[PDB]
Short mmCIF file of all heavy atoms in Angstrom, two decimals:
data_model
loop_
_atom_site.label_atom_id
_atom_site.label_comp_id
_atom_site.label_asym_id
_atom_site.label_seq_id
_atom_site.Cartn_x
_atom_site.Cartn_y
_atom_site.Cartn_z
N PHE A 1 0.85 -1.19 0.03
CA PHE A 1 0.00 -0.01 0.01
C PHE A 1 0.87 1.24 0.00
O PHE A 1 1.68 1.49 0.96
CB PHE A 1 -0.93 0.00 1.20
CG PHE A 1 -1.69 1.31 1.39
CD1 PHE A 1 -2.67 1.64 0.43
CD2 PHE A 1 -1.42 2.11 2.45
CE1 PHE A 1 -3.32 2.87 0.61
CE2 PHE A 1 -2.08 3.31 2.60
CZ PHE A 1 -3.05 3.67 1.70
N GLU A 2 0.70 2.04 -1.00
CA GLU A 2 1.32 3.38 -1.15
C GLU A 2 0.37 4.44 -0.62
O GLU A 2 -0.73 4.58 -1.16
CB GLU A 2 1.70 3.65 -2.56
CG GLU A 2 2.80 2.75 -3.14
CD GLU A 2 3.01 2.88 -4.65
OE1 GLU A 2 2.05 3.23 -5.45
OE2 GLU A 2 4.12 2.63 -5.17
N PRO A 3 0.75 5.15 0.47
CA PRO A 3 -0.14 6.23 0.97
C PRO A 3 -0.62 7.20 -0.08
O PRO A 3 0.16 7.55 -0.95
CB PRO A 3 0.77 6.92 1.94
CG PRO A 3 1.73 5.90 2.39
CD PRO A 3 2.00 5.07 1.21
N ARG A 4 -1.88 7.55 0.08
CA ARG A 4 -2.48 8.59 -0.78
C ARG A 4 -2.28 9.95 -0.23
O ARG A 4 -2.44 10.96 -0.97
CB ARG A 4 -3.99 8.29 -0.93
CG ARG A 4 -4.30 6.88 -1.44
CD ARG A 4 -5.81 6.56 -1.40
NE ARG A 4 -6.36 6.80 -0.09
CZ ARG A 4 -7.64 6.90 0.24
NH1 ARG A 4 -8.61 6.64 -0.72
NH2 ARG A 4 -7.98 7.24 1.43
N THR A 5 -2.07 10.09 1.08
CA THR A 5 -1.89 11.36 1.78
C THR A 5 -0.88 11.10 2.91
O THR A 5 -0.61 9.95 3.27
CB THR A 5 -3.14 11.92 2.39
OG1 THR A 5 -3.31 11.30 3.68
CG2 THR A 5 -4.43 11.69 1.60
N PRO A 6 -0.31 12.17 3.46
CA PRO A 6 0.64 11.96 4.53
C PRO A 6 0.05 11.35 5.83
O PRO A 6 0.80 10.94 6.72
CB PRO A 6 1.15 13.37 4.89
CG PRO A 6 0.71 14.21 3.72
CD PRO A 6 -0.43 13.58 3.07
N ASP A 7 -1.26 11.34 5.91
CA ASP A 7 -1.89 10.66 7.11
C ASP A 7 -1.86 9.13 7.00
O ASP A 7 -2.21 8.43 7.99
CB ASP A 7 -3.37 11.05 7.24
CG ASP A 7 -3.61 12.55 7.57
OD1 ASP A 7 -2.79 13.15 8.30
OD2 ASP A 7 -4.64 13.03 7.10
N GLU A 8 -1.63 8.62 5.86
CA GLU A 8 -1.75 7.16 5.58
C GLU A 8 -0.39 6.46 5.72
O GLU A 8 0.67 7.11 5.51
CB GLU A 8 -2.39 6.95 4.18
CG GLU A 8 -3.78 7.60 4.17
CD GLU A 8 -4.51 7.47 2.91
OE1 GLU A 8 -4.01 6.90 1.92
OE2 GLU A 8 -5.66 8.01 2.86
N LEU A 9 -0.44 5.23 6.15
CA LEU A 9 0.77 4.46 6.48
C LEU A 9 1.18 3.58 5.34
O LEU A 9 0.44 2.73 4.84
CB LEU A 9 0.41 3.58 7.70
CG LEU A 9 1.47 2.54 8.14
CD1 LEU A 9 2.78 3.28 8.52
CD2 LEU A 9 0.90 1.70 9.25
N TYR A 10 2.47 3.66 4.95
CA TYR A 10 3.08 2.76 3.95
C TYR A 10 3.31 1.42 4.62
O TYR A 10 3.76 1.27 5.74
CB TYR A 10 4.46 3.32 3.58
CG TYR A 10 5.20 2.43 2.65
CD1 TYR A 10 4.90 2.53 1.25
CD2 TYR A 10 6.20 1.59 3.11
CE1 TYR A 10 5.61 1.66 0.39
CE2 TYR A 10 6.92 0.78 2.21
CZ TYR A 10 6.62 0.84 0.86
OH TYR A 10 7.31 0.10 -0.06
N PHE A 11 3.04 0.36 3.76
CA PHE A 11 3.50 -0.99 4.16
C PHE A 11 3.62 -1.84 2.93
O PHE A 11 3.03 -1.51 1.88
CB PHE A 11 2.55 -1.63 5.19
CG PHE A 11 1.07 -1.67 4.75
CD1 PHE A 11 0.58 -2.68 3.97
CD2 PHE A 11 0.23 -0.68 5.17
CE1 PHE A 11 -0.77 -2.71 3.65
CE2 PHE A 11 -1.15 -0.66 4.86
CZ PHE A 11 -1.61 -1.74 4.08
N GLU A 12 4.38 -2.93 3.06
CA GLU A 12 4.58 -3.85 1.97
C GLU A 12 3.88 -5.15 2.25
O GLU A 12 3.69 -5.57 3.33
CB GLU A 12 6.13 -4.10 1.74
CG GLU A 12 6.77 -2.79 1.31
CD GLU A 12 8.28 -2.81 1.20
OE1 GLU A 12 8.90 -3.89 1.43
OE2 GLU A 12 8.88 -1.77 0.82
N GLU A 13 3.51 -5.86 1.12
CA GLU A 13 2.91 -7.14 1.19
C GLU A 13 3.66 -8.09 2.14
O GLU A 13 4.90 -8.15 2.02
CB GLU A 13 2.87 -7.75 -0.21
CG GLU A 13 2.16 -9.12 -0.23
CD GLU A 13 1.82 -9.66 -1.61
OE1 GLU A 13 1.89 -8.89 -2.63
OE2 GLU A 13 1.49 -10.84 -1.72
N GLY A 14 2.98 -8.73 3.08
CA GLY A 14 3.66 -9.61 4.05
C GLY A 14 4.04 -8.93 5.31
O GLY A 14 4.32 -9.66 6.33
N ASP A 15 4.08 -7.57 5.36
CA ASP A 15 4.49 -6.91 6.62
C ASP A 15 3.44 -7.15 7.70
O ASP A 15 2.23 -7.25 7.46
CB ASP A 15 4.63 -5.41 6.36
CG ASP A 15 5.88 -5.04 5.56
OD1 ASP A 15 6.79 -5.89 5.34
OD2 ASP A 15 5.96 -3.84 5.20
N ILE A 16 3.88 -7.15 8.94
CA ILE A 16 2.98 -7.14 10.14
C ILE A 16 2.65 -5.72 10.44
O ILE A 16 3.46 -4.78 10.47
CB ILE A 16 3.69 -7.84 11.31
CG1 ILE A 16 4.17 -9.24 10.90
CG2 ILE A 16 2.84 -7.85 12.54
CD1 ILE A 16 3.08 -10.17 10.43
N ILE A 17 1.34 -5.54 10.68
CA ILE A 17 0.79 -4.18 11.06
C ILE A 17 0.12 -4.39 12.39
O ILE A 17 -0.69 -5.27 12.57
CB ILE A 17 -0.25 -3.76 9.97
CG1 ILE A 17 0.44 -3.78 8.58
CG2 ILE A 17 -0.75 -2.38 10.27
CD1 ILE A 17 -0.47 -3.61 7.42
N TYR A 18 0.44 -3.49 13.31
CA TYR A 18 -0.14 -3.50 14.66
C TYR A 18 -1.23 -2.45 14.71
O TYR A 18 -0.92 -1.24 14.48
CB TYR A 18 0.97 -3.19 15.68
CG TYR A 18 2.07 -4.20 15.55
CD1 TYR A 18 3.29 -3.90 14.86
CD2 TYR A 18 1.96 -5.53 16.07
CE1 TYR A 18 4.27 -4.84 14.70
CE2 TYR A 18 2.97 -6.49 15.87
CZ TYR A 18 4.11 -6.12 15.20
OH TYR A 18 5.16 -7.01 14.97
N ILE A 19 -2.46 -2.84 14.91
CA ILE A 19 -3.61 -1.99 14.82
C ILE A 19 -4.06 -1.56 16.21
O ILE A 19 -4.25 -2.36 17.09
CB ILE A 19 -4.73 -2.68 14.07
CG1 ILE A 19 -4.38 -3.08 12.66
CG2 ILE A 19 -6.02 -1.89 14.05
CD1 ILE A 19 -4.23 -1.91 11.71
N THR A 20 -4.23 -0.22 16.39
CA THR A 20 -4.63 0.33 17.69
C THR A 20 -5.95 1.06 17.65
O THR A 20 -6.41 1.49 18.67
CB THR A 20 -3.50 1.27 18.23
OG1 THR A 20 -3.26 2.30 17.24
CG2 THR A 20 -2.24 0.53 18.47
N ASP A 21 -6.59 1.22 16.49
CA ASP A 21 -7.93 1.78 16.47
C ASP A 21 -8.60 1.22 15.23
O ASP A 21 -8.12 1.38 14.11
CB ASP A 21 -7.88 3.32 16.40
CG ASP A 21 -9.18 4.12 16.38
OD1 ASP A 21 -10.18 3.79 15.72
OD2 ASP A 21 -9.24 5.21 17.03
N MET A 22 -9.76 0.62 15.42
CA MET A 22 -10.59 0.00 14.39
C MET A 22 -12.02 0.57 14.45
O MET A 22 -12.98 -0.04 14.01
CB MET A 22 -10.63 -1.54 14.58
CG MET A 22 -9.22 -2.17 14.56
SD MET A 22 -9.26 -3.99 14.80
CE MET A 22 -11.05 -4.07 14.73
N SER A 23 -12.17 1.77 14.93
CA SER A 23 -13.52 2.39 15.04
C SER A 23 -14.23 2.73 13.74
O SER A 23 -15.46 2.84 13.70
CB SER A 23 -13.34 3.67 15.88
OG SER A 23 -12.67 4.72 15.26
N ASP A 24 -13.48 3.00 12.70
CA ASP A 24 -14.00 3.15 11.33
C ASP A 24 -13.92 1.82 10.62
O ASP A 24 -12.99 1.05 10.80
CB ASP A 24 -13.09 4.17 10.68
CG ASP A 24 -13.62 4.61 9.31
OD1 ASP A 24 -14.51 5.48 9.31
OD2 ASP A 24 -13.22 4.01 8.29
N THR A 25 -14.91 1.53 9.72
CA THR A 25 -14.95 0.26 9.02
C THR A 25 -13.78 0.11 8.02
O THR A 25 -13.20 -0.97 7.88
CB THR A 25 -16.27 0.20 8.25
OG1 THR A 25 -17.33 0.18 9.22
CG2 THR A 25 -16.34 -1.11 7.49
N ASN A 26 -13.50 1.22 7.31
CA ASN A 26 -12.55 1.14 6.17
C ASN A 26 -11.12 1.55 6.48
O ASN A 26 -10.24 1.05 5.76
CB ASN A 26 -13.05 1.96 4.98
CG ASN A 26 -14.19 1.35 4.24
OD1 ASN A 26 -14.79 0.37 4.66
ND2 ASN A 26 -14.51 1.95 3.05
N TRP A 27 -10.90 2.39 7.45
CA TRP A 27 -9.55 3.01 7.69
C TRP A 27 -9.20 2.83 9.15
O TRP A 27 -9.95 3.37 10.02
CB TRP A 27 -9.48 4.46 7.19
CG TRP A 27 -9.50 4.42 5.67
CD1 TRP A 27 -10.61 4.46 4.89
CD2 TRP A 27 -8.33 4.38 4.78
NE1 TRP A 27 -10.19 4.39 3.56
CE2 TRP A 27 -8.84 4.37 3.44
CE3 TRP A 27 -6.97 4.34 5.00
CZ2 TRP A 27 -8.00 4.27 2.39
CZ3 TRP A 27 -6.13 4.27 3.91
CH2 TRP A 27 -6.64 4.27 2.61
N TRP A 28 -8.17 2.10 9.40
CA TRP A 28 -7.74 1.79 10.80
C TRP A 28 -6.44 2.52 11.13
O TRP A 28 -5.65 2.84 10.24
CB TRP A 28 -7.52 0.28 10.93
CG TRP A 28 -8.82 -0.47 10.83
CD1 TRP A 28 -10.10 -0.05 10.86
CD2 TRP A 28 -8.83 -1.91 10.66
NE1 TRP A 28 -10.99 -1.14 10.71
CE2 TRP A 28 -10.23 -2.24 10.62
CE3 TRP A 28 -7.91 -2.91 10.57
CZ2 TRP A 28 -10.70 -3.58 10.44
CZ3 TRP A 28 -8.33 -4.20 10.42
CH2 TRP A 28 -9.71 -4.55 10.37
N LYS A 29 -6.17 2.79 12.39
CA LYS A 29 -4.93 3.36 12.82
C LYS A 29 -3.99 2.24 13.19
O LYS A 29 -4.35 1.32 13.97
CB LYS A 29 -5.01 4.29 14.04
CG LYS A 29 -3.56 4.63 14.38
CD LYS A 29 -2.94 5.74 13.54
CE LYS A 29 -2.10 6.65 14.35
NZ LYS A 29 -2.26 6.44 15.83
N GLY A 30 -2.76 2.32 12.70
CA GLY A 30 -1.83 1.30 13.12
C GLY A 30 -0.36 1.67 12.85
O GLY A 30 -0.11 2.88 12.51
N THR A 31 0.50 0.74 13.04
CA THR A 31 1.94 1.02 12.92
C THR A 31 2.58 -0.20 12.28
O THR A 31 2.16 -1.37 12.48
CB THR A 31 2.48 1.43 14.30
OG1 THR A 31 3.83 1.79 14.18
CG2 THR A 31 2.53 0.26 15.23
N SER A 32 3.63 0.06 11.46
CA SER A 32 4.34 -0.97 10.80
C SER A 32 5.76 -0.50 10.62
O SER A 32 5.96 0.64 10.12
CB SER A 32 3.78 -1.32 9.38
OG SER A 32 4.40 -2.44 8.80
N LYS A 33 6.73 -1.26 11.07
CA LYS A 33 8.16 -0.93 10.81
C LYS A 33 8.52 0.51 11.11
O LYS A 33 9.12 1.26 10.27
CB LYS A 33 8.60 -1.05 9.35
CG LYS A 33 8.40 -2.45 8.76
CD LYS A 33 9.26 -3.51 9.44
CE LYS A 33 9.24 -4.85 8.76
NZ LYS A 33 9.54 -5.92 9.74
N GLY A 34 8.11 1.03 12.24
CA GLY A 34 8.68 2.35 12.59
C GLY A 34 7.85 3.49 12.21
O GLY A 34 8.13 4.64 12.58
N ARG A 35 6.77 3.34 11.45
CA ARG A 35 5.90 4.42 11.07
C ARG A 35 4.47 4.16 11.52
O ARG A 35 4.09 3.01 11.77
CB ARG A 35 5.83 4.49 9.52
CG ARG A 35 7.21 4.75 8.89
CD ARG A 35 7.08 4.69 7.31
NE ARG A 35 8.41 4.76 6.73
CZ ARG A 35 9.05 5.92 6.58
NH1 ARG A 35 8.46 7.13 6.81
NH2 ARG A 35 10.34 5.92 6.06
N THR A 36 3.66 5.24 11.66
CA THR A 36 2.28 5.11 12.10
C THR A 36 1.37 5.85 11.10
O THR A 36 1.80 6.80 10.46
CB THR A 36 2.09 5.78 13.51
OG1 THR A 36 2.40 7.16 13.41
CG2 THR A 36 2.94 5.05 14.53
N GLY A 37 0.16 5.44 11.01
CA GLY A 37 -0.86 6.19 10.19
C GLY A 37 -2.02 5.28 9.96
O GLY A 37 -2.20 4.23 10.50
N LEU A 38 -2.86 5.79 8.94
CA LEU A 38 -4.10 5.12 8.64
C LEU A 38 -3.85 4.05 7.53
O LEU A 38 -3.09 4.26 6.57
CB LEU A 38 -5.12 6.13 8.07
CG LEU A 38 -5.54 7.21 9.06
CD1 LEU A 38 -6.44 8.19 8.28
CD2 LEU A 38 -6.26 6.60 10.24
N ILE A 39 -4.54 2.94 7.69
CA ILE A 39 -4.42 1.79 6.73
C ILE A 39 -5.79 1.39 6.25
O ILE A 39 -6.75 1.38 6.98
CB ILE A 39 -3.60 0.64 7.22
CG1 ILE A 39 -4.31 0.02 8.40
CG2 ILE A 39 -2.21 1.00 7.65
CD1 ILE A 39 -5.15 -1.21 8.13
#
């Protein structure tokens, strides 16, 4: 996933993403490899 905006989190296929907010259906807050943002 390539972020569309600076609020969104980059990650690569197979990466582990740690999710800390799932209140929205489509866009979650989380962190992967040192960065945080929306996924």
Side-chain angles (χ1 to χ4, degrees):
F1 173 67
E2 295 171 332
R4 304 172 308 165
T5 84
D7 295 325
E8 298 180 0
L9 173 60
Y10 178 81
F11 53 86
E12 297 175 358
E13 183 170 345
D15 288 349
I16 306 302
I17 308 168
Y18 304 101
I19 299 290
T20 54
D21 183 317
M22 302 181 7
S23 72
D24 187 83
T25 297
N26 285 9
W27 289 87
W28 295 345
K29 173 81 142 348
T31 186
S32 187
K33 303 297 189 206
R35 300 173 186 277
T36 63
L38 297 176
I39 64 98

